[PDB]
Design a protein around this motif. Structure first.
Motif, PDB file in Angstrom:
ATOM      1  N   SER A  93       1.172  -1.261  -0.261  1.00 31.64           N
ATOM      2  CA  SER A  93       0.019  -0.106  -0.052  1.00 31.64           C
ATOM      3  C   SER A  93       1.069   1.555   0.104  1.00 31.64           C
ATOM      4  O   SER A  93       0.647   2.426  -0.705  1.00 31.64           O
ATOM      5  CB  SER A  93      -1.113   0.020   1.551  1.00 31.64           C
ATOM      6  OG  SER A  93      -0.410   0.482   2.444  1.00 31.64           O
ATOM      7  N   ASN A  94       1.764   1.122   1.128  1.00 23.95           N
ATOM      8  CA  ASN A  94       2.867   2.353   0.851  1.00 23.95           C
ATOM      9  C   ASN A  94       4.076   2.044   1.200  1.00 23.95           C
ATOM     10  O   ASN A  94       4.319   0.434   1.773  1.00 23.95           O
ATOM     11  CB  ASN A  94       2.136   3.529   1.964  1.00 23.95           C
ATOM     12  CG  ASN A  94       3.259   4.685   2.077  1.00 23.95           C
ATOM     13  OD1 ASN A  94       3.562   5.029   0.993  1.00 23.95           O
ATOM     14  ND2 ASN A  94       2.934   5.225   2.855  1.00 23.95           N
ATOM     15  N   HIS A  95       5.327   2.782   0.772  1.00 21.46           N
ATOM     16  CA  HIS A  95       6.231   2.334   1.420  1.00 21.46           C
ATOM     17  C   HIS A  95       7.369   2.088   2.630  1.00 21.46           C
ATOM     18  O   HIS A  95       7.925   1.866   3.013  1.00 21.46           O
ATOM     19  CB  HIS A  95       7.408   3.294   0.380  1.00 21.46           C
ATOM     20  CG  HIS A  95       7.574   4.754   0.868  1.00 21.46           C
ATOM     21  ND1 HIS A  95       8.089   5.526   2.252  1.00 21.46           N
ATOM     22  CD2 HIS A  95       6.764   5.515  -0.032  1.00 21.46           C
ATOM     23  CE1 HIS A  95       7.606   6.264   2.281  1.00 21.46           C
ATOM     24  NE2 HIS A  95       7.510   6.788   0.741  1.00 21.46           N
ATOM     25  N   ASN A  96       6.335   2.595   3.533  1.00 19.67           N
ATOM     26  CA  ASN A  96       6.430   2.051   4.749  1.00 19.67           C
ATOM     27  C   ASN A  96       5.381   0.668   5.047  1.00 19.67           C
ATOM     28  O   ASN A  96       6.147   0.989   6.870  1.00 19.67           O
ATOM     29  CB  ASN A  96       6.329   4.046   6.444  1.00 19.67           C
ATOM     30  CG  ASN A  96       4.792   4.401   5.700  1.00 19.67           C
ATOM     31  OD1 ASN A  96       4.002   3.075   4.853  1.00 19.67           O
ATOM     32  ND2 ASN A  96       4.441   4.805   6.632  1.00 19.67           N
ATOM     33  N   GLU A  97       5.386   0.752   4.280  1.00 22.01           N
ATOM     34  CA  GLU A  97       5.132  -0.475   5.229  1.00 22.01           C
ATOM     35  C   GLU A  97       5.561  -2.038   5.730  1.00 22.01           C
ATOM     36  O   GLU A  97       6.627  -1.869   4.404  1.00 22.01           O
ATOM     37  CB  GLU A  97       3.594  -1.381   4.000  1.00 22.01           C
ATOM     38  CG  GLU A  97       2.436  -0.571   4.331  1.00 22.01           C
ATOM     39  CD  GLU A  97       1.220  -0.460   5.100  1.00 22.01           C
ATOM     40  OE1 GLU A  97       1.016  -0.634   6.229  1.00 22.01           O
ATOM     41  OE2 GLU A  97       1.212   1.171   5.519  1.00 22.01           O
ATOM     42  N   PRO A  98       5.401  -3.246   6.184  1.00 19.11           N
ATOM     43  CA  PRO A  98       6.154  -3.995   6.170  1.00 19.11           C
ATOM     44  C   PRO A  98       5.962  -5.241   5.212  1.00 19.11           C
ATOM     45  O   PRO A  98       5.148  -5.479   4.363  1.00 19.11           O
ATOM     46  CB  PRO A  98       5.992  -5.212   7.671  1.00 19.11           C
ATOM     47  CG  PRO A  98       3.899  -4.716   7.546  1.00 19.11           C
ATOM     48  CD  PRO A  98       4.579  -3.288   7.141  1.00 19.11           C
TER      49      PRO A  98
END
Lengths: 283, 69, 69, 72, 71
Positions: free
Chosen positions: D23-28
């Motif tokens: 979903s976004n680049h800070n997700e695991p």
């Protein structure tokens, strides 16, 4: 003594210099710290040994801080086969000019190989200096040893270094410099113990990982003349897939030892083995 | 004998310099392959329905021991 | 397609720069492994006593010839 | 060259790696995604962090150009 | 013909120069001896073939001076 003498010695400093290459392979050269801080060092040298520890420890082990196999070394052994994280076995040697035996962890290679039609006055030497970088520790009885030998095995020159000798970048790692005498035909290098018991790399050279959690060794050869004899570096070809992309074989799943003897269990096991060989790249 | 061939690029790395593959996160490229060459196993002539099975067990043991598994 | 990732070090080689392993003194790293892919040996169903032994001899010969010993 | 992930299809290898949704680049990142992991700046307990310092400052990534695409 | 023309030609000499990279990938470039002596040569080039001979000869052989396989 030197051409450039670097005496920068604080742990919080970050030094980065540029030195003209022709000052480094000269009769006096530069000291070990200056080569440490020489950002263009690959203009005068190439690595003749580069090694670091794996990421995932092999069975059995309690950590992954040192190499767990003897894959890089022609002689010697691992300290203990029940805990591979102890590292290499360090055997006793009385002084750095003594002969190394197949019990000691060491490697050997030959330098300045010219034919019979060439006079030695014309061909010249191949390696001028050797620089070794290893992790730092405050104490220990293990030693890194390096020897230069003439044609008939006799030691022209030699030296060894203690864990706290490697401190040009305290408290992590450092460099030391070795002078290759003229007329050397072979070089031996390795790790030994300076006291009279069998030691391990963990507890007698790395002081139980009190300063470094990842062991590494890098050895740089400064050539007497840039590439007269051809620099040493890993083989490669842009046209061969084995060197361009790598080898695609993978480890095979474990096949349990089979005891089937009705004249078909053996056939099925053989067919399974051949299928796995074909599946995993060996074919 | 040695042979080294150097390619001077028209533009430094526009198409990507050629050089051996590597990955700091993969142990095959970081440390190398730990497979070792197996000891010689002589060709066997035992045909009593179990000498063959013992030879196969020996081959599997050597494979497992020397990295191939 | 190609992918190249470069780490700039905070201090040139304080922790040791990452690059492929090498040793001028080990022939594995100085010249590479000499193993070759084995020619296909078809799955064998010979069941008297002897087809199995002959297939084992063929496999051992191929292993010896192709560098796995 | 990759510890996690898969190839897109086993009937045409020239499609390349499989790209999974994130979903976004800070997700695991999970074992389904194509990624690698490594550890940096490993010093012992007898060394103060203020003395040992950082290991990597910047990372420069080169790869091929395309005008558009949802891959990242 | 060239940008830099090196004509150093004695066997006991040890030459080591620095040359700006942009002079080497140009319409004229430098001659083969200047590149021989250019110590920063890995700033404009990379090895597309590197091969040397093994240390221990393979069976059968009488020496180990040349590569013994077609690898």
């Amino acid at each position: 003594k030197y051409n450039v003498w670097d005496a920068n010695g604080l742990a919080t400093n970050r030094i980065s210099g540029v030195i003209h290459p022709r000052l480094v392979n000269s009769r006096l050269g530069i000291n070990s710290v200056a080569f440490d801080n020489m950002s263009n060092k690959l203009d005068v040298s190439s690595l003749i040994h580069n090694e670091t520890s794996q990421i995932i420890g092999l069975t059995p082990s309690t950590g992954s801080n040192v190499p767990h196999t003897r894959i890089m070394w022609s002689n010697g052994a691992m300290y203990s086969s029940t805990d591979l994280n102890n590292g290499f076995r360090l055997n006793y040697l009385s002084n750095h000019n003594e002969p190394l035996t197949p019990m000691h962890l060491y490697n050997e290679f030959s330098v300045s190989e010219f034919g019979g039609s060439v006079t030695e006055s014309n061909a010249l030497d191949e390696i001028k200096y050797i620089f070794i970088q290893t992790t730092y520790a405050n104490s220990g009885d293990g030693r890194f040893i390096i020897q230069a030998l003439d044609a008939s095995g006799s030691v022209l020159s030699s030296n060894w270094y203690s864990p706290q000798s490697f401190n040009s970048t305290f408290p992590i790692s450092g460099f030391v410099r070795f002078d290759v005498p003229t007329g050397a035909k072979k070089i031996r290098y390795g790790f030994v113990n300076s006291a009279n018991y069998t030691g391990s790399l963990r507890s007698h050279f790395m002081s139980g990982f009190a300063y470094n959690k990842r062991f590494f060794l890098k050895i740089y050869a400064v050539y007497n003349d840039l590439g007269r004899y051809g620099q040493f570096e890993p083989p490669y070809s842009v046209a061969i897939d084995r060197f361009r992309v790598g080898d695609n074989t993978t480890q095979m799943p474990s096949i349990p030892a089979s005891s089937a003897t009705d004249v078909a269990g053996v056939n099925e096991v053989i067919n399974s083995l051949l299928a796995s060989l074909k599946a995993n790249g060996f074919m």
